[PDB]
């Protein structure tokens, strides 16, 4: 139903090792479709999903030029950050930015985003109204006044309401076979003895898309939030994802425990138990 497009910029200074490096990636939902690396011998925006390849030379040339311009801008932004924080030119620092649009089920703009960070901490963010900014510290307030004076938020709002939604909707249609068809998880429960008196029950969810999923363990219908070990959702490398949840149970109580799986790909939520004689 809902969909999103996000661009992620990373700019990192490397004093004494070369000029600052700029890396950009673009995502539609959980699918990466473009990349740019200033460290490449011939830097260009490159396809990373099959449905983006149909775009013309005008698209790749325009994207590459914009990425080249952005790399130069963030090279200067890194120097500006040194002034605001009174930092030496010998240290390594990172600026990050993520921006994009969220589309509602009706296919229209639901929310726009534009956030920036310095050394992994919030710096400045565009507010939900797409007209004002929130600055994290006094240095970012210097940037906020410059952006207010230069009417940056109106430029962001025009992009987020217009080109961002238009390009995202185009990608969703061109890649509808993969982007708009959810892959349900393949699920099973495994049992691992820890001792003669205790065992781990592990609930698996494999090969699902998109990444959002809910895995919970229940004991006699009661969620075991505190005692559940939950690993981060992880990529399988084929554009689908994996996750598991585990709980340690007394030997002989295993059948009291149920694993519950919620995913967009499933018609109904799943309820699983250890079934050794499957």
């Amino acid at each position: 139903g809902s969909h999103s497009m996000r661009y992620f910029y990373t700019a990192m200074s490397r004093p004494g090792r070369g000029e600052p490096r700029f890396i950009a990636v673009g995502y539609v939902d959980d699918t990466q479709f473009v990349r740019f690396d200033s460290d490449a011998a011939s830097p260009r925006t490159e396809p990373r999903a099959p449905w983006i390849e149909q775009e013309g030379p005008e698209y790749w040339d325009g994207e590459t030029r914009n990425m080249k311009a952005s790399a130069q801008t963030y090279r200067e932004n890194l120097r500006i950050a040194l002034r605001y924080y009174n930092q030496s030119e010998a240290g390594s620092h990172i600026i990050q930015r993520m921006y994009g649009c969220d589309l509602g089920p009706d296919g229209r703009l639901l929310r726009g985003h534009d956030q920036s960070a310095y050394d992994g901490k919030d710096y400045i963010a565009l507010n939900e109204d797409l007209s004002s900014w929130t600055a994290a510290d006094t240095a970012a307030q210097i940037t906020q006044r410059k952006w207010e004076a230069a009417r940056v938020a109106e430029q962001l709002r025009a992009y987020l309401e217009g080109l961002c939604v238009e390009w995202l909707r185009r990608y969703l249609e061109n890649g509808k076979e993969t982007l708009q068809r959810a892959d349900p998880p393949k699920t099973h429960v495994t049992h691992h003895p820890v001792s003669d008196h205790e065992a781990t029950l592990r609930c698996w969810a494999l090969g699902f898309y998109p990444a959002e999923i809910t895995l919970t363990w229940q004991r006699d219908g009661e969620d075991q939030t505190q005692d559940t070990e939950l690993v981060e959702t992880r990529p399988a490398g084929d554009r689908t994802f994996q996750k598991w949840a585990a709980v340690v149970v007394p030997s002989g109580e295993e059948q009291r425990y149920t694993c519950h799986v919620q995913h967009e790909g499933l018609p109904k939520p799943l309820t699983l138990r250890w079934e050794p004689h499957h």
Binding site: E63, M67, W167
Partner: peptide
């Protein structure tokens, strides 16, 4: 462009 064309500094 798909990406944000705009450039203004910090």
């Amino acid at each position: 462009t798909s990406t944000l064309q705009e450039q203004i500094g910090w």
